[PDB]
Scaffold this active site. Structure first.
Site, PDB file in Angstrom:
ATOM      1  N   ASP A  32     -33.746 -24.504 -17.831  1.00  0.00           N
ATOM      2  CA  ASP A  32     -34.353 -23.917 -16.639  1.00  0.00           C
ATOM      3  C   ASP A  32     -35.744 -24.494 -16.401  1.00  0.00           C
ATOM      4  O   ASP A  32     -36.679 -23.772 -16.045  1.00  0.00           O
ATOM      5  CB  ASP A  32     -34.396 -22.389 -16.735  1.00  0.00           C
ATOM      6  CG  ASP A  32     -34.560 -21.715 -15.384  1.00  0.00           C
ATOM      7  OD1 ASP A  32     -34.240 -22.357 -14.360  1.00  0.00           O
ATOM      8  OD2 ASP A  32     -35.005 -20.546 -15.351  1.00  0.00           O
ATOM      9  N   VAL A  73     -44.508  -7.378 -17.032  1.00  0.00           N
ATOM     10  CA  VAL A  73     -45.349  -8.200 -17.894  1.00  0.00           C
ATOM     11  C   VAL A  73     -46.779  -7.686 -17.817  1.00  0.00           C
ATOM     12  O   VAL A  73     -47.314  -7.480 -16.721  1.00  0.00           O
ATOM     13  CB  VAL A  73     -45.270  -9.691 -17.515  1.00  0.00           C
ATOM     14  CG1 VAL A  73     -46.113 -10.525 -18.470  1.00  0.00           C
ATOM     15  CG2 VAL A  73     -43.831 -10.157 -17.532  1.00  0.00           C
ATOM     16  N   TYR A  93     -36.372  -7.896 -13.872  1.00  0.00           N
ATOM     17  CA  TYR A  93     -36.435  -8.514 -15.189  1.00  0.00           C
ATOM     18  C   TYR A  93     -37.327  -7.752 -16.159  1.00  0.00           C
ATOM     19  O   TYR A  93     -37.477  -8.186 -17.306  1.00  0.00           O
ATOM     20  CB  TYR A  93     -36.962  -9.945 -15.055  1.00  0.00           C
ATOM     21  CG  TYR A  93     -38.327 -10.015 -14.405  1.00  0.00           C
ATOM     22  CD1 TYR A  93     -38.456 -10.137 -13.026  1.00  0.00           C
ATOM     23  CD2 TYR A  93     -39.489  -9.946 -15.167  1.00  0.00           C
ATOM     24  CE1 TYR A  93     -39.700 -10.193 -12.427  1.00  0.00           C
ATOM     25  CE2 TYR A  93     -40.735 -10.000 -14.578  1.00  0.00           C
ATOM     26  CZ  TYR A  93     -40.835 -10.125 -13.208  1.00  0.00           C
ATOM     27  OH  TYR A  93     -42.075 -10.183 -12.612  1.00  0.00           O
ATOM     28  N   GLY A 114     -47.405  -8.258 -13.471  1.00  0.00           N
ATOM     29  CA  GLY A 114     -46.287  -8.414 -12.565  1.00  0.00           C
ATOM     30  C   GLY A 114     -45.078  -7.696 -13.118  1.00  0.00           C
ATOM     31  O   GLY A 114     -45.122  -7.095 -14.196  1.00  0.00           O
ATOM     32  N   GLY A 115     -43.989  -7.767 -12.357  1.00  0.00           N
ATOM     33  CA  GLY A 115     -42.773  -7.097 -12.765  1.00  0.00           C
ATOM     34  C   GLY A 115     -41.711  -7.001 -11.691  1.00  0.00           C
ATOM     35  O   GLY A 115     -42.012  -7.041 -10.494  1.00  0.00           O
TER      36      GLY A 115
HETATM   37  C1  LIG Z   1     -42.405 -13.690 -18.615  1.00  0.00           C
HETATM   38  C2  LIG Z   1     -42.554 -15.171 -18.972  1.00  0.00           C
HETATM   39  C3  LIG Z   1     -42.653 -16.077 -17.751  1.00  0.00           C
HETATM   40  O1  LIG Z   1     -41.444 -15.578 -19.770  1.00  0.00           O
HETATM   41  C4  LIG Z   1     -41.907 -16.034 -21.017  1.00  0.00           C
HETATM   42  O2  LIG Z   1     -41.254 -16.504 -21.890  1.00  0.00           O
HETATM   43  C5  LIG Z   1     -43.406 -15.862 -21.039  1.00  0.00           C
HETATM   44  C6  LIG Z   1     -44.344 -16.143 -22.051  1.00  0.00           C
HETATM   45  C7  LIG Z   1     -45.684 -15.918 -21.826  1.00  0.00           C
HETATM   46  C8  LIG Z   1     -46.109 -15.417 -20.611  1.00  0.00           C
HETATM   47  N1  LIG Z   1     -47.533 -15.204 -20.469  1.00  0.00           N
HETATM   48  C9  LIG Z   1     -48.297 -15.041 -19.249  1.00  0.00           C
HETATM   49  N2  LIG Z   1     -49.594 -14.851 -19.412  1.00  0.00           N
HETATM   50  C10 LIG Z   1     -50.383 -14.677 -18.367  1.00  0.00           C
HETATM   51  C11 LIG Z   1     -49.836 -14.722 -17.095  1.00  0.00           C
HETATM   52  C12 LIG Z   1     -50.674 -14.549 -15.996  1.00  0.00           C
HETATM   53  N3  LIG Z   1     -50.320 -14.498 -14.722  1.00  0.00           N
HETATM   54  C13 LIG Z   1     -51.388 -14.316 -13.974  1.00  0.00           C
HETATM   55  C14 LIG Z   1     -51.394 -14.204 -12.450  1.00  0.00           C
HETATM   56  C15 LIG Z   1     -50.906 -15.448 -11.862  1.00  0.00           C
HETATM   57  C16 LIG Z   1     -50.751 -15.350 -10.346  1.00  0.00           C
HETATM   58  O3  LIG Z   1     -50.030 -14.163  -9.882  1.00  0.00           O
HETATM   59  C17 LIG Z   1     -50.266 -12.916 -10.615  1.00  0.00           C
HETATM   60  C18 LIG Z   1     -50.542 -13.063 -12.113  1.00  0.00           C
HETATM   61  N4  LIG Z   1     -52.441 -14.239 -14.771  1.00  0.00           N
HETATM   62  O4  LIG Z   1     -52.005 -14.382 -16.065  1.00  0.00           O
HETATM   63  C19 LIG Z   1     -48.465 -14.931 -16.952  1.00  0.00           C
HETATM   64  N5  LIG Z   1     -47.833 -14.987 -15.641  1.00  0.00           N
HETATM   65  C20 LIG Z   1     -46.418 -15.240 -15.475  1.00  0.00           C
HETATM   66  C21 LIG Z   1     -46.243 -16.237 -14.337  1.00  0.00           C
HETATM   67  O5  LIG Z   1     -46.917 -15.727 -13.220  1.00  0.00           O
HETATM   68  C22 LIG Z   1     -45.729 -13.937 -15.089  1.00  0.00           C
HETATM   69  C23 LIG Z   1     -46.479 -12.787 -14.910  1.00  0.00           C
HETATM   70  C24 LIG Z   1     -45.851 -11.604 -14.552  1.00  0.00           C
HETATM   71  C25 LIG Z   1     -44.480 -11.582 -14.378  1.00  0.00           C
HETATM   72  C26 LIG Z   1     -43.731 -12.731 -14.554  1.00  0.00           C
HETATM   73  C27 LIG Z   1     -44.357 -13.919 -14.911  1.00  0.00           C
HETATM   74  N6  LIG Z   1     -47.736 -15.086 -18.046  1.00  0.00           N
HETATM   75  C28 LIG Z   1     -45.184 -15.128 -19.621  1.00  0.00           C
HETATM   76  C29 LIG Z   1     -43.809 -15.371 -19.854  1.00  0.00           C
END
Ligand SMILES: CC1(C)OC(=O)c2ccc(Nc3ncc(-c4nc(C5CCOCC5)no4)c(N[C@H](CO)c4ccccc4)n3)cc21
Ligand SMILES: CC1(C)OC(=O)c2ccc(Nc3ncc(-c4nc(C5CCOCC5)no4)c(N[C@H](CO)c4ccccc4)n3)cc21
Ligand code: NA
Lengths: 285, 293
Positions: free
Chosen positions: A133, A27, A24, A20-21
């Site tokens: 938050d 990621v 901000y 995603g992205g």
């Molecule tokens: C950036 C954020 C929130 O701030 C932190 O401090 C942090 C620490 C570990 C973090 N790790 C992690 N690991 C794995 C995922 C994952 N998302 C998915 C699917 C779920 C359904 O939609 C598509 C993606 N599959 O895996 C994830 N998603 C998050 C929440 O969606 C996310 C992804 C991209 C952009 C923003 C936030 N975040 C993240 C974060």
């Protein structure tokens, strides 16, 4: 940050997929080249003359946490005018990602989430950190059904803002409290968790359909009534009391995270990650 | 390639060479002046033929270039010209603490405490960067004219890194190897806590003008340290030094590396967090050095 790696993150991780992205940053799901372990890499713009104080504070918060319920931190890289923050991979995303598909969570699922969040909050508060938050979008879930608090961006912005604003001799005590602490304490996270519990039960926080400026004025009035769960019969007395106590209006009477961990909703037996594995099975099937 | 950021040009097009500051097997070190700004630098000149192994110098430049911290000597780039490699680094006009104490005599306890705090800050940074200095001593702690304490000379660190990489290339098939043999092959036989011990010895060096056992044959010293019953050294003139300094020596010179405190832990020690630890202590030392010169 004093401990940033001035190295290419691509020399250390294979970027498997962009998750995603937006404004901000971006990621990425990535794999450690040495260990094969999955991580999440957040890429943010970091150009020569940019203000670094907020990202600085965010890394400072992450680097000094060592608790299972706070996203793990694996270092940061400055390369090609981007800062890459390496964090725990939570493969199910946030609870908000999940409930947009599954619908509302069961009371047991919410109880387990609240216990895990409270464990993380008690740890943060013991370090004099405030998340500021807490909400479904900032509670991440891994494929094992484990729960991690994430996204200290707002906490970092406030910590940087408060330091920037940082003579007091003519200030009223309530002004000095804003200048020093920001006007509140760590118990704000307890209220936010109570709202998050309603969010998980009803798919939106209270007053979500009211204009946000009107909401701000409403909550600041004397006589604001703390919200409640709408469908009283769907939920146990323990859940209703958890909402009542976490949404205590006066911070002097709102219980700490450690005290809330003794509440009957989150101390009851049978709360484990299997409840969230069930939720992920519903999401999949 | 020695360095992806190498300058393929003559450094004397940019710098006027002043005096040779030193030289030996490692090469020659020159004081030099930027032709535009007038700023001073130190240039290390090393022979570099097309056939020579570049691995050690490559790793030294990598450390200097990537490890940017107020307690690590500054780096200004490298030049390759006519089979000589020139590493351009910070000019630290007072030289090393060894250069200094050879003129001033022993440092005060407060001066030693400040040096230890600054070195520990540099070590905590280096260790977080996954690097081990491995040659902490008075001769490798430089003082610039601003009174700033800078860790320098990563030649041994680079040599060890190059030797580890080479030995790993020829490790051979691993399926019958014991885990401790695999660990030595990947990580070496010890860890970053060796630098904490070396700082403790350096603190005695700054107090007494010699490390302990300086008059003992080096091979005998190596044997004694590997004996069971080896006793870590101590400050010799007990009444000259505070209990905090004696305890700093005791804990940095913990024999077992499993029990030796990290750099971050040592930064909380009373000796290096007491009041009055300021840069003026070093500027006073430099004033004494200037009076002696
Ligand atoms: C950036 C954020 C929130 O701030 C932190 O401090 C942090 C620490 C570990 C973090 N790790 C992690 N690991 C794995 C995922 C994952 N998302 C998915 C699917 C779920 C359904 O939609 C598509 C993606 N599959 O895996 C994830 N998603 C998050 C929440 O969606 C996310 C992804 C991209 C952009 C923003 C936030 N975040 C993240 C974060
Ligand atoms: C080579 C070394 C240690 O490894 C590095 O990584 C590095 C980075 C910057 C470095 N910069 C610098 N700058 C200035 C001096 C200076 N010494 C004097 C007087 C002091 C009293 O006796 C005569 C010279 N005046 O200035 C200096 N001396 C040192 C310590 O003597 C030195 C010079 C030549 C060879 C080895 C070590 N080193 C050096 C180094
Ligand atoms: Na040296």
């Amino acid at each position: 940050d004093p401990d940033i790696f001035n190295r290419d993150p691509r020399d250390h991780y294979d970027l498997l997929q962009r998750l995603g992205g937006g404004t901000y940053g971006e990621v990425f799901k990535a794999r450690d080249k040495v260990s094969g372990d999955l991580v999440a890499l957040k890429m943010v713009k970091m150009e020569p003359d940019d203000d670094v104080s907020t990202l600085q504070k965010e890394i400072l918060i992450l680097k000094t946490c060592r608790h299972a319920n706070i996203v793990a931190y694996h270092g940061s890289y400055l390369w090609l005018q981007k800062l890459w923050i390496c964090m725990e991979f939570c493969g199910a995303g946030s609870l908000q990602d999940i409930y947009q598909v599954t619908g509302s969570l069961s009371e047991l699922q919410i109880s387990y989430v609240c216990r895990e969040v409270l464990q993380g909050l008690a740890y943060l508060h013991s370090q004099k950190k405030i998340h500021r938050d807490i909400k479904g979008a900032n509670i991440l879930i891994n494929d094992a059904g484990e729960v991690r608090l994430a996204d200290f961006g707002i906490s970092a912005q406030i910590g940087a803002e408060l330091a920037r604003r940082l003579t007091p001799y003519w200030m009223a005590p309530e002004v000095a409290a804003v200048a020093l602490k920001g006007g509140y304490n760590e118990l704000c996270d307890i209220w936010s968790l109570g709202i998050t519990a309603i969010e998980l039960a009803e798919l939106q926080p209270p007053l979500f359909d009211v204009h946000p400026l009107r909401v701000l004025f409403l909550m600041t009035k004397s006589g604001y009534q703390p919200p409640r769960l709408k469908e009283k019969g769907k939920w146990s007395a323990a859940f209703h009391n958890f909402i009542k106590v976490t949404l205590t209006k006066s911070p002097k009477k709102r219980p700490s995270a450690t005290k809330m961990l003794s509440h009957q909703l989150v101390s009851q037996p049978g709360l484990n990650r299997g409840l969230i594995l069930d939720l992920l099975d519903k999401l999949k099937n």
